Amino acid sequence: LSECKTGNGKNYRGTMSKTKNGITCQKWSSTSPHRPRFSPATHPSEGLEENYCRNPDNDPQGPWCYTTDPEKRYDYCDILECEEECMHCSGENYDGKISKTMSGLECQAWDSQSPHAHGYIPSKFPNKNLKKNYCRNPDRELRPWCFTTDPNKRWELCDIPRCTT
Template identity: 70%
Template sequence: MGRQELLLLLLLFLRPGHGDPLDSYVNTQGASLITFTRKQLPAASIAECAAKCEEETTFTCRSFQYHSKEQHCVVMGDNSKSAPVLRMRDVVLYEKRIYLSECKTGNGRRYRGTVSQTRNGVACQKWRDRSPHVPKYSPTSHPLEGLEENYCRNPDNDAEGPWCYTTDPATRFDYCTIPECEGQELPQTPSRLPSPHGNVL
């Protein structure tokens, strides 16, 4: 293998998205969560547990805990922002960084924080509700977009950033004020072409 091929191979390996999957988690030794949205699964390693969290389809997995002695994994729909934390021996709590952040990078495509009002102070409509506005984007039509509760999101990759349908019948949607993350890099996702969210298809 020539020098150029070796360099190309090294660059491909080091490009974003090919690092350690645990880099997208924050871990806390000896911590556990009190939550009802959970599933216990067998796992031989922390990496296997992380993979099970990523593959979970019953709920959005925001964290997992790995029990080293019992070699099992508990995937959870909550994190330390939404559930009480307990001290527990022989457990490591792993929380997805993206769900702990209350800031955005770029246009906020991957923002998963809990801001739930527009820049004008109007409460956001829950994504699953059909009143006062029938949404084009909903948890069932776009299950991978984090459309939970009434949190601001950017499911259509809008250049203006995260937005939500409003509870004001006269205003279909509005943008949210989400601060920029300073020096904090979040995992990248493939970009999609923007699509209009103001009209019902």
């Protein structure tokens, strides 16, 4: 479900399946080219599925996997950490905490219909993480935006900093 991690990623269940140097992960269920110490059979509650980066051993450096490079047993994956400071690109995956618009109006909460009735119902689009009243880009807008608490302005883009100047 969530393709980001919090903390050391013990509960990460995303679908990253490469390491941080781009090597495809080995399947946890496979014993070539590496024989795993952590496998679905031995550690069934750690979500060790396909070849997805996981943290079944509470490694302080986060999620990892056995690699398909015979000469490298395992390596850490490069996974996006949850929330923000900033947005990549146009904010398609922006899950940060800014909740006011360009003009400074406080956003209306996604799960509210006041002062603006709308169709962006969280339960309709759970994958879009329309959480509280945070700016989001569920629908390929220029940038994350929200509905506003100003009855006279239905919606407005937000001012989300770019991770790249």
